[PDB]
Symmetry: D2
Subunit: 369 residues, 4 copies
Amino acid sequence: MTIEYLKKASLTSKSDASDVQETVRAILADIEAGGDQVALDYAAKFDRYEGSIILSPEEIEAACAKVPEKLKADIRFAHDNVRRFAETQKATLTDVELEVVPGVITGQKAIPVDAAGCYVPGGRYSHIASAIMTVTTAKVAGCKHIMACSPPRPGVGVAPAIVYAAHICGADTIMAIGGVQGVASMAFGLFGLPKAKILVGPGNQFVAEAKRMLFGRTDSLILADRTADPHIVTTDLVSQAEHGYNSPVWLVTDDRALAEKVIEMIPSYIADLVNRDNAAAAWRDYAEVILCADREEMAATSDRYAPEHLTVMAEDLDWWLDRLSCYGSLFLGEESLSVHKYMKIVTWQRGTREGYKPVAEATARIARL
Amino acid sequence: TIEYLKKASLDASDVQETVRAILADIEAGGDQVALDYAAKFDRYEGSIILSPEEIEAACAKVPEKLKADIRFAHDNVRRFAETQKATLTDVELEVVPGVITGQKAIPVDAAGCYVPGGRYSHIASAIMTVTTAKVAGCKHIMACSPPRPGVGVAPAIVYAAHICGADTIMAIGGVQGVASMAFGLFGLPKAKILVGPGNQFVAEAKRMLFGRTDSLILADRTADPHIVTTDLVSQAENSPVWLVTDDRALAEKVIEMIPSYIADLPEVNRDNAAAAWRDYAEVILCADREEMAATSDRYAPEHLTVMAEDLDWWLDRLSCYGSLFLGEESLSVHKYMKIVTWQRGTREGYKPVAEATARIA
Amino acid sequence: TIEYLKKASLTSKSDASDVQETVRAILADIEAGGDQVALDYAAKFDRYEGSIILSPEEIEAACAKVPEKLKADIRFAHDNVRRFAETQKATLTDVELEVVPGVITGQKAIPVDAAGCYVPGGRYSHIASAIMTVTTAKVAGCKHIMACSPPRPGVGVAPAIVYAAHICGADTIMAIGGVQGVASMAFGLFGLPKAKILVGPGNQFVAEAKRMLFGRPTDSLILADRTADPHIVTTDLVSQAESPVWLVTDDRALAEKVIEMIPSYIADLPEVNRDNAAAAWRDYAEVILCADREEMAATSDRYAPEHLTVMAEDLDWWLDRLSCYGSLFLGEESSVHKYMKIVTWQRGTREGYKPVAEATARIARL
Amino acid sequence: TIEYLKKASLTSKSDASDVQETVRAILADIEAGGDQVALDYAAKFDRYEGSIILSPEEIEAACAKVPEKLKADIRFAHDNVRRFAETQKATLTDVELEVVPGVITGQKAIPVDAAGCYVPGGRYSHIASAIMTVTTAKVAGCKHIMACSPPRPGVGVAPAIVYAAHICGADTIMAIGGVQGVASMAFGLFGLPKAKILVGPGNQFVAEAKRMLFGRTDSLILADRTADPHIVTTDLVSQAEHGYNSPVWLVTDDRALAEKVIEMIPSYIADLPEVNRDNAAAAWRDYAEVILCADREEMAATSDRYAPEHLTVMAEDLDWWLDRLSCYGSLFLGEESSVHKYMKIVTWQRGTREGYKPVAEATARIARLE
């Protein structure tokens, strides 16, 4: 009503926004609409640094050059410890295969995520340790692309020790951007970067908020090629109308005939289930069918979709088990701060019982993971 | 190089990404965008806020067998809730000689109750959430339910919501409905809590808005600007700060004083302090104490210090805070209640046993 | 062939292998021997020759030695802790829920008969401990509170601890420490009741004795008077071999009637069930003959059954009387928290069908 | 005023009041009586007229009565569980870390001396449990594995349980059940080793017996002729400071040192403040022991047998002590400073800080210490 701002905060007011989140959402939405440029605008405004956002190799050399050899020696020693510890941890996450029942093989794998973003608030000693842990653990984890960002100091750039640590510990990209804009830049794959799948590293409450919002918190997908039995594919897609209030489902195939025949068969099958308004509604709100050219196309699609439930009804099940990388529970065949943080745990199973072994069954129940 | 042979209406990659798109769009757009998404997803050609007439007609459509069923479940939930709420009396405790700490349960201004349909589980849910929110004492209860085309909100839901105390019955579902309650669209208050089951979209748009610090000093003409300035300056020990006053004079004197105090610190402290004051602190002028307190509550600060006359009035009136320090000196009703803690006074002597006893809890 | 150039008065080999082993030894000796052996172990370990249970006079004389600055301090802390506790205890009401028409479930918080509070000494933290536990045990509503603290030779219990224990509600103040003290409360020595819960910090021996005696189910009991249908008790009793089971009755006839009926009901079970059931009946089941309803109730309570079924007249009486059990089913048809048993009861059968009321009742718990 | 129309086989009253009471009674009886009292309970409750520890003859005879289908089943279960276990065990290699320059902390998993495995009978789930537990303990590296199952009258242990136990790696198969069987493994009766761990499902009696015996800080200093009497005496006195109820041991092979330490103790109790002086004098009297051994081997053997939570070694040939000592909690070398359930995790460290390096410190601190 009245209120008169005798001061006014240059980033947490009202007449700027009401709440930390109102700001954070506003900013993320702005950056998401705008892209590289709106990110850059926020960076300029908040960080006040007019050097490049992604450090060029020369800048890295110049940064590393400013680090006393004593501090470098220290950093390599801390690095040594962390990476040795992490590779220990990583040995415990070996692939498993268990014939739970004769004829049925269940497995697990630890898969590294594509890209990790590591936020570093600055160049303090605690921050250098932070940067080492995060970049080193993410590297040993096997992430294909690691970004380290730190809010620059004006005219100074990224704290030089942060640059050194990031570099020796395995960071693919070193970024001069902080806070909400920085987090978004990694999250959204701005500036030609890949989309960070995990984002680790301490930060102030704006940074913590965008992160809870962006990375905090059941899809189903069926991969089928021309050999898939159109009856079974349509049956499965229909049974996604039991727990299918929500529950998106995708069909990824390389065969036109199959897909069109399935959209075809839906009216006959939806009809033959209380349920059968549900099912129909679900189908055209959530279900999606995608045509592919070759099998690699299907697999890459599947991966970028990272489905919670994955069924493979195609030839060469061995290939599909080898290739596919992002899923929750994979069923092959119609007849069906620590390294851990940077990894998917994926579970798969193939086959159907080719006999009966009650002792072995019960032993499996008792065992599990 | 991929082809969509069949597409789903609900074009984005992921639920969170989609939810954000809708939320951000609606936040800028207001009622009209909310309605737009209502049109698209809800597929229903009626008003969003049900009129007394619409309520009456819906009420008329529920068999008397079901009405009595709903009234009986309501009776049960109400005596149970009223029982619990009787256990939440203000307590104030002379913890150590001279320092009195207290606790209060205060009901939040507005609750949103989501009701996904008219199956018995949903009707139960609606009674549960709306009855409890009512008993807790929420000043405004919104019940919204996904409307079905031509039919509206399941008439049983209307009956339940209405008898159980809902102030607003809304024919809007999913992200648009959640947004409508959260942001105070259609003249409604901004829902502080949102309860009730929902699809994964409803749950996500809810984690964002309600899932997950700030400090304030309330001062009037009697506050001594030295203590106020020290107290605010020591906020560089990040985290926003407010000074809320009704005294034009006081405000400007403190605003004059800060850099002189910033100079008193060791050099690790001084850069941080200057930046913190620069970036996060804000000073606000109000007409009278009533004004000030209302401002304070709308800010709901984690730390609240009161440097004003008539502390008794301040303790009674102030409602939304984390910890209140008065003076320059120092499924269940619980869900709908914020627990506030206040402290008054300073140590009066030293009592080892009482202190050691306090240490535990 | 190893030589002990110095031995521990306690944790030595040839005196025992392990703390746990020593604790077992003492508890066993005390449990068999009783009062005198407890006393002898007190003599051995505390080395103090005043009364074990302080007389009222000893209490007053102990109180008199507490500087009044400290008395007032203790009184003040006690006031806060009581004022805090009564808040929580007000949160433990009696409930009643019509889960389905005709079937009413309950809960109650019941205070245990006797609670024991250990106090390891007389420092300020120890005093706070005593104030905490004795005060809470009183607010909770335990009929008998025993506080013991290890005596200091010639001195007795720390005067501050006597004052705290007394004003906070302790019914008994005991000058005994360690395993012998814990056992004295646990085993109801010296005319004291058997402590149901034991709270309070202590050395490794005290903690071990508490782990064994008070640390930590699907036992079963049926109360029947002559009205119970013998077929029904027989079925329910065998149904535990599907874990101790008791039939507690006051009508001799029923008991004998059911005993003879048992084997035919064992026979008319599938083939895996029959041997297991026969074994269980002889090995885990008991039939106990009582005088009247009263005796049965007292029996049920002393056994503290997890599952309790009442097949008698005046189900309201049993709901009123029976107060040590887990889950009560009446009829053939069917912080302060530490000091209390939570009992849940139900009566009745469906007398109707209210789908909403039922769904909401489902939520009230789940 | 009660009359017992039917009594349960030692579940009744004036037998006992309680499950816990019965278990304590039976356990106390067995600790006193030994083998013979254990046997008494066995005969009484189990009512089985054969031997307790199966001979190779009885084992092979038992094996012979198992249908070849079930043998195949069990072998398939064993093979799965074994391969899985050895995968997990490969992850448990000894690790060594220079957390700070000059300060080396390590971790290792030690297999326990003896695992006892309870098997309640011969039902399918029970066979899975037996395979599961005995195989896991075998892979873990238990030097001695005891399997016991209650014998059935005239038959003995279910031949199936004997088969699983034997192929899965069991060193001893026991025809004894319930409390008496838990007791027999736990107390090392019948010439058997004392079971350090006890795994396996069982009735209320068995579960309480194993809660009693296995449910839920001691200190030891190993010193040889080279240790500093002042250092030892101060640590032992400072073990009567914040841990004066916690037992303390001095294990040495040099009489001279020990005698000197004992003579120094009271003068050191004298030179500290009086809140301390009574507590310490008491603590030394009540909890401290000084044990003289013939040689260092006797020392390490004592140490392991005592299995101390805190262990400090003030002797020469520190590398040897690190290699030799097996059962401790935290080992401090030098005067300066799933297979899992079947294994002790021991942490050791040697050296002192021995430079600075602020980053390594900060990294070690965030690393949650240890």
